Design a protein around this ligand. Structure first.
Ligand SMILES: *[C@@H]1O[C@H](CO)[C@@H](O[C@@H]2O[C@H](CO)[C@@H](O[C@@H]3O[C@H](CO[C@H]4O[C@H](CO)[C@@H](O)[C@H](O[C@H]5O[C@H](CO)[C@@H](O)[C@H](O)[C@@H]5O)[C@@H]4O)[C@@H](O)[C@H](O[C@H]4O[C@H](CO)[C@@H](O)[C@H](O)[C@@H]4O[C@H]4O[C@H](CO)[C@@H](O)[C@H](O)[C@@H]4O)[C@@H]3O)[C@H](O)[C@H]2NC(C)=O)[C@H](O)[C@H]1NC(C)=O
Ligand SMILES: *[C@@H]1O[C@H](CO)[C@@H](O[C@@H]2O[C@H](CO)[C@@H](O[C@@H]3O[C@H](CO[C@H]4O[C@H](CO)[C@@H](O)[C@H](O)[C@@H]4O)[C@@H](O)[C@H](O[C@H]4O[C@H](CO)[C@@H](O)[C@H](O)[C@@H]4O[C@H]4O[C@H](CO)[C@@H](O)[C@H](O)[C@@H]4O)[C@@H]3O)[C@H](O)[C@H]2NC(C)=O)[C@H](O)[C@H]1NC(C)=O
Ligand SMILES: *[C@@H]1O[C@H](CO)[C@@H](O[C@@H]2O[C@H](CO)[C@@H](O[C@@H]3O[C@H](CO)[C@@H](O)[C@H](O)[C@@H]3O)[C@H](O)[C@H]2NC(C)=O)[C@H](O)[C@H]1NC(C)=O
Ligand SMILES: *[C@@H]1O[C@H](CO)[C@@H](O[C@@H]2O[C@H](CO)[C@@H](O[C@@H]3O[C@H](CO)[C@@H](O)[C@H](O)[C@@H]3O)[C@H](O)[C@H]2NC(C)=O)[C@H](O)[C@H]1NC(C)=O
Ligand SMILES: *[C@@H]1O[C@H](CO)[C@@H](O[C@@H]2O[C@H](CO)[C@@H](O[C@@H]3O[C@H](CO)[C@@H](O)[C@H](O)[C@@H]3O)[C@H](O)[C@H]2NC(C)=O)[C@H](O)[C@H]1NC(C)=O
Ligand SMILES: *[C@@H]1O[C@H](CO)[C@@H](O[C@@H]2O[C@H](CO)[C@@H](O)[C@H](O)[C@H]2NC(C)=O)[C@H](O)[C@H]1NC(C)=O
Ligand SMILES: *[C@@H]1O[C@H](CO)[C@@H](O[C@@H]2O[C@H](CO)[C@@H](O)[C@H](O)[C@H]2NC(C)=O)[C@H](O)[C@H]1NC(C)=O
Ligand SMILES: *[C@@H]1O[C@H](CO)[C@@H](O[C@@H]2O[C@H](CO)[C@@H](O)[C@H](O)[C@H]2NC(C)=O)[C@H](O)[C@H]1NC(C)=O
Ligand SMILES: *[C@@H]1O[C@H](CO)[C@@H](O[C@@H]2O[C@H](CO)[C@@H](O)[C@H](O)[C@H]2NC(C)=O)[C@H](O)[C@H]1NC(C)=O
Ligand SMILES: *[C@@H]1O[C@H](CO)[C@@H](O[C@@H]2O[C@H](CO)[C@@H](O)[C@H](O)[C@H]2NC(C)=O)[C@H](O)[C@H]1NC(C)=O
Ligand SMILES: *[C@@H]1O[C@H](CO)[C@@H](O)[C@H](O)[C@H]1NC(C)=O
Ligand SMILES: *[C@@H]1O[C@H](CO)[C@@H](O)[C@H](O)[C@H]1NC(C)=O
Ligand SMILES: *[C@@H]1O[C@H](CO)[C@@H](O)[C@H](O)[C@H]1NC(C)=O
Ligand SMILES: *[C@@H]1O[C@H](CO)[C@@H](O)[C@H](O)[C@H]1NC(C)=O
Ligand SMILES: *[C@@H]1O[C@H](CO)[C@@H](O)[C@H](O)[C@H]1NC(C)=O
Ligand SMILES: *[C@@H]1O[C@H](CO)[C@@H](O)[C@H](O)[C@H]1NC(C)=O
Ligand SMILES: *[C@@H]1O[C@H](CO)[C@@H](O)[C@H](O)[C@H]1NC(C)=O
Ligand SMILES: *[C@@H]1O[C@H](CO)[C@@H](O)[C@H](O)[C@H]1NC(C)=O
Ligand SMILES: *[C@@H]1O[C@H](CO)[C@@H](O)[C@H](O)[C@H]1NC(C)=O
Lengths: 101, 133, 388, 39
């Protein structure tokens, strides 16, 4: 994993796994240490209730490029472990939640 | 308001039948899609499959179809059945809900779409160890 | 009489020195002020079904296609044994074939990879193992790139001492007399569009739709329907596919398909529903006079080859083969029906399919391999009549 | 004899397989090449 723990007020970027190879629909998750994994982003941009606008994602120009979560203005409640569930119409199935971080 | 409550054996013997029940508090089970998520320590989460309104289920081929998800709609509880367990199945378990999501990319009538699932309401956590001791 | 006729094509083209297929370098530039002498009380009779210009034009078009692809690559070292798999999609129409080929130096060997379509392969006899579609009955020739297929118009001119007569009647069938005859030396701007089942970039009739046949009671005579307002069709092929370049022998390159970048989609065409409903409704009012007692139905075609029973045309480099089963459904008694549900959606779609190897004009020893076009494809044709 | 029954390997229409064929043809169409008569 790559550790990115800068003093607060900067912008963090975390990249996901496999190269793209078709149109995607990628989730994101927040597994706090000692806690349960919490959903953050579905459909590459969409944000449920209770999450601030500091999180964004990657569009569907995908076609060989990596998926990325972006955290602008990192705060104190932003240190956890983030996973990455994968979907695309071209590469088959998925049964794991991507490489850990 | 809905709450999930894992309740299993805690410690069993290998090569036997196991059962873990997630008690649901807040809604009847006929409106939601249900799933279990296991976590081996250090590695990533794993999704065993799902269960639906019309008993739609597709179990993981890497789980090798040794699982049958059972349900208790009377006590509003989500159970689980799994036979001939291995010591590699030692994992922190979770019970969770699932929602419908459909992605379109071409003309629909040719079948150029697919389905994906998000998990929003999570459980609280339990640990079942498959060990000889 | 009967004579030879020569080409005429004007200089809105002829700025680049390129050779397409319908030569246009040897075509004389046509006259800017074409003289049309309107004759007097002159009644000549015309016969659409005994006309020599049609056989001249058929021989000409076959000979023009035979001029090009004479100095082109022969694909005789390509009829070899092909392996295959399917394309790595989820869990098909294009195959990922591999084959041994001799290199440019006839002492070594080389292993290659190419993607191309089903309808261009035949199974040979577990590992699936086959060969190409037409390499036991025909010698096959790759058409060159930088050689255009675009149908630019052709005027037919008669030599000195001859003349061409012309029918100016509004409603004129085949095989009758006229009472309004003009004379020219140079015909209409006729476009060589090669297509089945429908007539695309044509010429429209005036104030009615007109139905022609030789003997309409005889059912072995084809029927030509000419409309008076066009019905637009809008085809495409949405796949961003590359092209390889395999070199076979000295100075001869072979152009295959490489990978596919993106999604895998089919090749729809989107004809409009209400407009074509109007068209098909006003065809049958003229049809109900030649058979004035009965219901008439439109049924689809009959099985067979894909290049006979389907609408086949040329869309900027590829050859499309859409089938017209969503068109020809219905059943009409009193110029009304219930076979369209008056709801749901507009835009009747059609399913095309792509084919490289083509032996149009039903050849028995010759074929053609159209190399792939890089990018995406659109046509927007302009339907003017049809063949029943 | 004035006829000859001849057999020969041929490379067929598909340029990987080897076929074996028979044909009768006349003397005065042959030349002896060099026991089996092999011309
Ligand atoms: C022959 O006729 C047929 C029909 O008979 C035509 O077929 C059509 O083909 C197009 C593609 O060429 C299909 O479009 C696809 O439709 C998807 C669903 O559309 C609706 O999606 C949601 C509802 O779930 C709405 O929000 C949309 O409405 C909004 O967008 C449109 C855009 O024009 C506006 O007009 C509306 O006013 C709304 O603003 C639609 O109603 C659609 O989701 C999809 O687009 C996504 O995917 C492509 C793939 O690259 C992306 O480029 C695009 O940006 C979209 O991506 C979304 O999601 C990602 C991440 O998830 C984000 O990054 C994006 O910002 C975006 O949110 C695509 O457009 C259409 O469905 C299909 N018709 C039918 C009936 O199936 C043929 O084209 C026609 N052929 C010819 C030659 O004429
Ligand atoms: C890559 O390609 C594979 C192809 O192998 C593809 O797998 C297919 O996945 C889909 C998605 O799950 C499967 O389709 C669904 O199957 C379920 C369950 O049926 C299967 O399982 C039972 C045993 O559990 C078997 O007895 C049965 O024979 C099947 O094998 C169905 O319940 C699904 O129906 C829903 O979808 C329909 C399409 O829209 C709806 O019309 C239908 O009503 C259902 O939708 C919901 O509608 C309402 C919404 O709320 C609700 O009221 C309803 O109750 C219902 O919940 C559907 O048939 C399919 O079987 C798989 N293919 C095969 C061959 O098994 C992958 O998905 C694909 N992956 C990618 C990324 O493209
Ligand atoms: C292109 O030409 C090559 C020439 O080498 C072909 O390779 C062939 O590959 C097979 C499979 O490895 C070889 O078969 C071998 O058979 C022995 C005998 O049982 C076995 O012990 C080996 O493990 C192996 O299976 C074969 O010798 C080899 N060569 C030839 C001349 O056949 C290749 O198949 C050709 N490809 C195409 C598409 O034609
Ligand atoms: C004649 O060709 C037409 C196509 O123009 C065919 O009509 C199609 O019929 C199917 C089934 O009847 C329709 O599918 C269904 O439509 C309803 C109405 O919205 C919808 O609720 C369903 O979910 C489903 O989509 C289809 O829409 C319709 N196509 C069009 C363009 O209207 C017809 O089947 C052909 N044959 C005959 C005998 O009419
Ligand atoms: C056409 O090609 C075939 C290819 O098999 C030729 O067959 C050859 O036939 C001879 C005679 O049977 C084979 O000779 C063998 O020799 C060993 C050692 O003496 C002996 O033990 C065997 O019983 C057999 O006689 C030979 O292996 C075989 N194959 C090849 C590659 O030569 C055939 O002769 C050809 N015909 C013509 C007209 O060229
Ligand atoms: C085209 O229309 C003309 C009418 O001007 C038809 O010519 C007449 O046809 C009838 C019936 O066959 C004959 O009895 C007449 O002798 C024809 N000539 C004239 C001057 O009336 C002609 O048959 C039509 N052709 C087709 C193919 O329908
Ligand atoms: C068609 O099949 C060939 C099989 O060799 C594929 O070529 C290899 O693809 C892998 C996968 O990325 C590469 O690592 C290799 O470098 C490729 N070449 C060789 C010689 O092994 C090819 O990618 C396939 N094409 C499609 C579209 O599926
Ligand atoms: C359109 O034509 C097909 C055949 O060209 C007809 O299909 C036949 O349908 C009958 C219905 O009872 C079957 O018994 C036959 O076996 C079918 N095939 C053949 C070859 O006759 C079809 O009925 C026609 N449609 C309409 C509306 O007339
Ligand atoms: C032409 O397209 C039509 C589309 O309606 C095809 O008709 C149906 O194709 C499906 C495909 O599986 C079959 O299950 C049906 O039996 C077909 N008929 C009907 C009435 O729905 C048709 O097959 C296409 N023609 C060819 C030669 O492929
Ligand atoms: C020429 O020689 C060949 C030797 O193979 C003869 O062909 C065989 O003849 C026998 C006897 O009739 C048949 O049973 C076989 O089926 C034939 N073919 C093969 C491949 O063995 C052929 O008949 C001879 N011709 C003459 C005129 O003598
Ligand atoms: C054609 O017929 C009309 C009427 O009979 C006659 O007056 C005229 O002179 C004729 N010729 C021309 C060239 O109009
Ligand atoms: C070529 O092969 C195909 C299929 O094997 C067959 O239909 C065709 O008749 C063959 N041609 C000849 C001349 O044998
Ligand atoms: C004959 O056709 C010409 C074509 O332009 C037209 O000008 C002329 O009026 C027509 N004559 C009659 C009598 O209809
Ligand atoms: C047209 O076809 C009918 C039907 O076969 C035949 O009787 C007739 O002789 C044909 N010719 C004419 C001029 O009607
Ligand atoms: C098609 O693929 C090529 C590959 O580099 C790319 O340059 C081009 O932009 C693509 N076109 C579209 C429309 O995506
Ligand atoms: C068709 O023939 C019948 C007699 O069989 C007749 O009564 C009817 O009027 C005819 N149809 C029309 C449209 O005239
Ligand atoms: C003929 O038309 C009538 C009314 O116009 C309709 O009821 C009937 O279904 C049609 N077809 C037949 C075969 O009578
Ligand atoms: C097609 O035209 C007929 C006659 O005008 C009409 O009854 C029918 O509703 C039309 N269908 C559609 C889909 O517009
Ligand atoms: C599709 O239908 C619309 C009407 O909803 C029409 O305006 C459009 O021209 C059609 N598309 C074509 C004919 O390509």
């Amino acid at each position: 994993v790559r550790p990115l723990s800068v003093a607060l007020g900067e912008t963090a970027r975390i990249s996901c796994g496999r190269q793209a190879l078709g149109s995607r629909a990628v989730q994101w998750y927040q597994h706090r240490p000692g806690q349960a994994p919490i959903l953050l982003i579905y459909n590459n941009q969409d944000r449920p209730s209770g999450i601030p606008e500091r999180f964004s994602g990657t569009p569907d120009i995908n076609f060989g490029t990596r998926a990325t979560l972006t955290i602008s203005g990192v705060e104190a409640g932003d240190e956890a472990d983030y996973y990455c569930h994968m979907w695309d119409s071209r590469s088959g199935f998925s049964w794991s939640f991507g490489g850990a971080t | 308001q809905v709450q999930l409550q894992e309740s299993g054996p805690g410690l069993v013997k290998p090569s036997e039948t196991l059962s873990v029940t997630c008690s649901v508090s807040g809604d009847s089970m006929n409106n939601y899609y249900w799933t279990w998520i296991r976590q081996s320590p250090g590695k990533g989460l794993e999704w065993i499959g799902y269960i639906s309104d019309r008993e739609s289920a597709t179990y993981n081929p890497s789980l090798n179809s040794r699982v049958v998800i059972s349900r208790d709609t009377s006590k509003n509880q989500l159970s689980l059945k799994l036979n001939s367990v291995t010591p590699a199945d030692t994992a922190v378990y979770y019970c969770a809900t699932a929602r419908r999501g459909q992605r379109i990319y071409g003309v629909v009538s040719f079948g150029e779409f697919f389905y994906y699932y998000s998990m929003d309401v999570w459980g609280k956590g339990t640990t079942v160890t498959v060990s000889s001791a | 009489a009967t004579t030879t006729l020569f080409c005429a094509s004007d200089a809105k083209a002829y700025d680049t020195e390129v050779h397409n297929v319908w030569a246009t370098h040897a075509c004389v530039p046509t006259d800017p002020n074409p003289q049309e002498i309107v004759l007097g009380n002159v009644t000549e009779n015309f016969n659409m079904w005994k006309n020599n210009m049609v056989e001249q034009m058929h021989e000409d078009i076959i000979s023009l296609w035979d001029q090009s692809l004479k100095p082109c690559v022969k694909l005789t070292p390509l009829c070899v044994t092909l392996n295959c798999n399917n394309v790595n999609t989820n869990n098909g129409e294009m195959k990922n074939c591999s084959f041994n080929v001799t290199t440019s130096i006839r002492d070594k060997i080389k292993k290659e990879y190419a993607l191309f379509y089903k309808l261009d392969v035949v199974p040979l006899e577990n590992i699936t193992n086959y060969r190409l579609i037409n390499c036991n009955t025909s010698v096959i020739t790759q058409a060159c790139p930088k050689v255009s297929f675009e149908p630019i118009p052709i005027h037919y001119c008669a030599p000195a001492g001859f003349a061409i007569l012309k029918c100016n009647s509004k409603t004129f069938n085949g095989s009758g007399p006229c009472t309004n005859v003009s004379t020219v030396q140079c015909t209409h701007g006729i476009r060589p569009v090669v297509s089945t089942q429908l007539l695309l970039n044509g010429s429209l009739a005036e104030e009615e739709i007109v139905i022609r046949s030789e003997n309409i009671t005889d059912n072995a005579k084809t029927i030509i329907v000419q409309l008076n307002e066009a019905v637009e069709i809008n085809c495409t092929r949405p796949n961003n596919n590359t092209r390889k370049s395999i070199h076979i022998g000295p100075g001869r390159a072979f152009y295959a398909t490489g990978d596919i970048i993106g999604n895998i989609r089919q090749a729809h065409c989107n004809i409009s529903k209400a407009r074509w409903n109007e068209t098909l409704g006003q065809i049958v009012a003229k049809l109900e006079e030649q058979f004035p007692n009965k219901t008439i139905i439109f049924n689809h075609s009959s099985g067979g080859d894909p290049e006979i029973v389907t609408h086949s045309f040329n869309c900027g480099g590829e050859f499309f083969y859409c089938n017209t089963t969503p068109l020809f459904n219905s059943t009409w008694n009193n110029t009304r029906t219930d076979d369209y549900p008056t709801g749901g959606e507009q835009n009747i779609t059609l399913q095309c399919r792509i084919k490289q190897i083509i032996n149009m004009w039903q050849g028995v020893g010759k074929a053609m391999y159209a190399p792939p076009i890089r990018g995406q494809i659109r046509c927007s044709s302009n339907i003017t009549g049809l063949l029943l």
